[PDB]
Amino acid sequence: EGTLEVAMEYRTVTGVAGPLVILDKVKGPKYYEIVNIRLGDGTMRRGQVLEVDGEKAVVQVFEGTSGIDNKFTTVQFTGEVLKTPVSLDMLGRIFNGSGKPIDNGPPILPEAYLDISGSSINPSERTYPEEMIQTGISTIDVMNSIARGQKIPLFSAAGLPHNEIAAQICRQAGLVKRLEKDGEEDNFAIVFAAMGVNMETAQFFKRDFEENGSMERVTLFLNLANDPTIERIITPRIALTTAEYLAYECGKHVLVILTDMSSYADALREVSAAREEVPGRRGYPGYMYTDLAQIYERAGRIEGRKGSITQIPILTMPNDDITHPTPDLTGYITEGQIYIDRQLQNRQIYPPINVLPSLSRLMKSAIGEGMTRRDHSDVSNQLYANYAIGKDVQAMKAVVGEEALSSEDLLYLEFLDKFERKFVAQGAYDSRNIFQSLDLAWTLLRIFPRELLHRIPGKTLDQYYSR
Amino acid sequence: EFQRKLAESSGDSGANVKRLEQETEVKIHHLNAGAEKIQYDVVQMLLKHVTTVKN
Amino acid sequence: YGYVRKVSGPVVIADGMNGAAMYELVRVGHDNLIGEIIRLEGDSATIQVYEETAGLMVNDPVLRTHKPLSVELGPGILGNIFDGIQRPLKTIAIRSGDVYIPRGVSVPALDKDTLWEFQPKKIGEGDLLTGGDLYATVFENSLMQHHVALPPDAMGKVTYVAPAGQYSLKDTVLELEFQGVKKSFTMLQAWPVRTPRPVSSKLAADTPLLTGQRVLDALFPSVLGGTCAIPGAFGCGKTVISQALSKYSNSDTVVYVGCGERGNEMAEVLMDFPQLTMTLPDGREESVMKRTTLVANTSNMPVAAREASIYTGITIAEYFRDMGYNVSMMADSTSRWAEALREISGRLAEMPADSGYPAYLAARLASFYERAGKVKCLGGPERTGSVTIVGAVSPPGGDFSDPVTSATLSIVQVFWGLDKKLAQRKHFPSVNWLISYSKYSTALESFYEQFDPDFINIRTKAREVLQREDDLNEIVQLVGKDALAEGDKITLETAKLLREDYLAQNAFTPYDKFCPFYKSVWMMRNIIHFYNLANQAVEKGAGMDGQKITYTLIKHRLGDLFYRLVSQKFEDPAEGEPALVAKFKKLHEDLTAGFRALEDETR
Amino acid sequence: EKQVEIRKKIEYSMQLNASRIKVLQAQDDLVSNMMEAASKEVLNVSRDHNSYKKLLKGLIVQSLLRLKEPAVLLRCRKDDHHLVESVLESAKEEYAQKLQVHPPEIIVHHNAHGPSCSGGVVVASRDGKIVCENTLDARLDVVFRKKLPEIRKQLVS
């Protein structure tokens, strides 16, 4: 505070293996101190100190390690942790992985520097997700709904249109309370962070956001596949810090779309392997759970502020499974799971969301008579049961023949057909009102007689079984 | 009707562009005035921080 | 004293320790982070930091404390929320206006300035007192009294006991003299987090848990001081069972220590339990926050804090059992705890074992679980109290081959194995009755006999019916119900009725919010009596047909009794036992009228 | 017609983005003017010859205390080299007073050109492995970086 000290500059780069440069004969080395590397050519890269030991210190480099020499490579210890500048002007701009602006504009003029991995929120100050946001997609709205401050990861496999449905959610997300909801603060101020994305996907998201008229609202941090791998382990943290500043300290509802968390697990694997650490499941680092918790638990409404953070981190299973460590840990941590199945895609339904594997822990809070129809929970719990039992019936009929099925079996099969065709499918640009979705669900349910509707209570039946 | 609608849209777009240009000019003027007002104090503070050493 | 050498993740190697014993808590850096020793190599000692390690220097001072991980006990421990290292969260949020938890905050675990009322238990001057003797009682809050006891490592003659009145923890409420020297005692009591509290002798449990849910309390019971394990499932499980064990259980208090779980779920729990007006007393609606305690440590919390959270939770259980209450501790952790062990073991460069988990995982889980069990307390008066450990296991997506699951099942006595298939079908209590078990079924013989001398037989009959149905489900999956005879058909009808009436429960309505034992046993007896009478009728074969013809006869001309049986779940418990018992006795009489009236005209 | 009006809305949004980007770029240009003025003032500070020596002594003391190395090799501009040569052993005496250590064996030769230096010293250690750049131009752009949020907070209007 009194007087400053200009950062030291070294040259003792005694070891360079992969993405790690191993400095030596260093003094006063901070942990996670951000370093500046000036090569012999004069280009400047930026790195981080993964480990400090005695006089040595191991430094990973974001922009790669394609030119370091033991003689000329200068490294400089800034003596501080990462601090991404943040300002209200950060809305409506597109950025590189580490925060450098790529919109041909000027660099951010900061309102303040906020250290990455922001300060932990005391649980005695959080509040449960109260309000519900309308996702547009009917399957999400009727079962597995999303409340403000939720963490819903979309589970997908290679080739499925997870990016398309993410864009649809970004275009269609909005409040639901009594169908009443300018709303500039109600505008979700989407912060999109893409890691390891094919350039076609980045162009697609850019064009969709530009066309939807949200270019003055959304914000993009991109870490393309050709871009250096290490920046993928910083980009989501930068995005979450920016979201935290835009929501908690500015009072804007914020929505976050982390893309290809498997492309983040890959960065974790590369870093862990480069350090010769003890591996975990499938060779992933033993602390992948801690990192995923640190990257997910930074969303949720806060009591003292009017803001909120609701993130939808999409995920790509490697071989289309769940036992893989990354989707498994994500399911452990996150409060939801939306499943996109290859079977539905093979049958050509644009939203391939398999409603049976789906789950939302906070579903019972978002719905209710105060903000939804009183029958919403009943309707959902019945459709789920009939779909599950009908699927069992279809599996049985696959071996016993269509003739051996009973009348209830035929009813269940017809319910499955109309559910997978008329209900799940929805337009790529057409939304569905929550009440319209419930009306469609009731039309699907009314195939069965009143006797078979075991889950639905008679009180809700009387007001809805006829309509 | 369509020709009238497109003509009205073009007129509204021109009006919005002119309003944006005027607002931009006003903003630039305000920022330049503030910078001119506060430049000397800013530079004095910067030099005071630079030109001090402790121990 | 000592200085840092190496900083990698949460593992810090500080040189110059020399005489620094294992697990001797040390304080690291200028920010003064808490931290426990994990390994030694000479003048240097490994430390776990329990906090973010970003910003540690080299030659940054580390101070030793000579004390292992210790949690501060005493009045006011109930109804609070503590971090894994036992920091009062609400105190931090109020004392510092910042909504965040600042790095390296130093706040006492219990407030040292609140005025507490002191009621000495007739202890006279010059009297002799000993470890755990209960010399004074303090009403921490209404409907939950807090006895004050001497620490187990204390004894002496009572030279001075404070009089009744308002006291604070900084004051000396009692004085003792022993072996020619005197010692003082305050209302605080610090205890190492490990090294469980001493017990005069353990005991064999006899009282059941009698939890709210019908399946748990009837099919797979647990005893007070028992040991359970659910697979930490959501929607079901971690929410409905937690609510039942917290607000609808006979345990005198609750200790929720669920760590390593979602932050939104923790906020929901911590915002819903404040109201939670459970009728724990006979005629009072006191909120259960005057009865429970949270040791919440979210997933984003430092990896090294999971074990600390678990052990502080079980230590708090012990303080209450020692006073006399039958505490029941629920741990949504032990799924993230195994991950914490893997993280620390790998970082400490330990050699992994089967499936990568540390070889000593079973030892740690045993050292945790075996602190359960009802126990005859220390000191005077004679007393008894118990601790229940209803832990968590990996969700039903992995088989029992999981090392954490195998280790738990090698120790845990009662397994409430929830199945994901039931969760898909939206069966909300979701206990799979084929794979669950309860080794306590033999000790509860006395209680079952005294409550109802015929419950064991009806329970065995229900188990046989369920097993028979699950057995012939495969045969039906091949051939179909065409070949099913009268006995098979009636068995499947009774199994379906049991599955949808008995084994289900909504828990969001007064019909199934809390099912007392009498109502559950009456449902079981009614269903089993119907099954037995129907089997006898179809075995009679009167009217030259009997059999499946008689089955259709009782399902059509006698189906009103069947509908009343399947609707018996809706008997409102608020009507009281003398009313519901009469209603069920009338239904039983009507059922006995059937299968005799049906046999009157020989079908 | 729908896509025409959608394209018109997109064009309006693009124009709004262009206007706001122009405003932001003008803001950055003003910040650059501020930095240029600060650099000019820093250069003007070198005109002094009495307090300038005290500042140089303070800078060399700070750097030598930060290195805490047995043998540094200070490098100073050819202009005002006389001032450094005059202060000489005063810095060594101050450092030896700071802690019970033998006086460093400083060495002072090649100098960078004035505008590159603009005052300040580069101290470094033997073999140049560890370098401390206490140039005035180096003290600036660090104070600037730290105080930039305060600058924006000062630029309310």
From Swiss-Prot, chain C:
InterPro entries: ATP-synt_VA_C (IPR055190), ATP-synth_a_Xtn (IPR031686), ATP_synth_asu-like_sf (IPR023366), ATPase_a/bsu_AS (IPR020003), ATPase_F1/V1/A1_a/bsu_N (IPR004100), ATPase_F1/V1/A1_a/bsu_N_sf (IPR036121), ATPase_F1/V1/A1_a/bsu_nucl-bd (IPR000194), ATPase_F1/V1_b/a_C (IPR024034). GO terms for cellular component: plant-type vacuole; proton-transporting V-type ATPase, V1 domain. HAMAP family: ATP_synth_A_arch. It holds the Pfam family ATP-synt_ab_Xtn. Keywords: ATP-binding, Hydrogen ion transport, Ion transport, Nucleotide-binding, Translocase, Transport. It catalyses: ATP + H2O + 4 H(+)(in) = ADP + phosphate + 5 H(+)(out). GO terms for biological process: ATP metabolic process. V-ATPase is a heteromultimeric enzyme composed of a peripheral catalytic V1 complex (main components: subunits A, B, C, D, E, and F) attached to an integral membrane V0 proton pore complex (main component: the proteolipid protein). It comes from Citrus unshiu (Satsuma mandarin). ATP binds at residues 232-239. Catalytic subunit of the peripheral V1 complex of vacuolar ATPase. V-ATPase vacuolar ATPase is responsible for acidifying a variety of intracellular compartments in eukaryotic cells. This is V-type proton ATPase catalytic subunit A. Belongs to the ATPase alpha/beta chains family. GO terms for molecular function: ATP binding; ATP hydrolysis activity; proton-transporting ATPase activity, rotational mechanism. Its EC number is 7.1.2.2. It is an enzyme of class 7 (translocase). Disulfide bonds: none annotated.
Swiss-Prot record, chain D:
Belongs to the V-ATPase E subunit family. Subunit of the peripheral V1 complex of vacuolar ATPase essential for assembly or catalytic function. V-ATPase is responsible for acidifying a variety of intracellular compartments in eukaryotic cells. The chain holds residues 59 to 226 of 230 of the full protein. This is V-type proton ATPase subunit E. The lineage of its organism: Eukaryota, Viridiplantae, Streptophyta, Embryophyta, Tracheophyta. Keywords: Hydrogen ion transport, Ion transport, Transport. V-ATPase is a heteromultimeric enzyme composed of a peripheral catalytic V1 complex (components A to H) attached to an integral membrane V0 proton pore complex (components: a, c, c', c'' and d). GO terms for cellular component: proton-transporting two-sector ATPase complex, catalytic domain. GO terms for molecular function: proton-transporting ATPase activity, rotational mechanism.
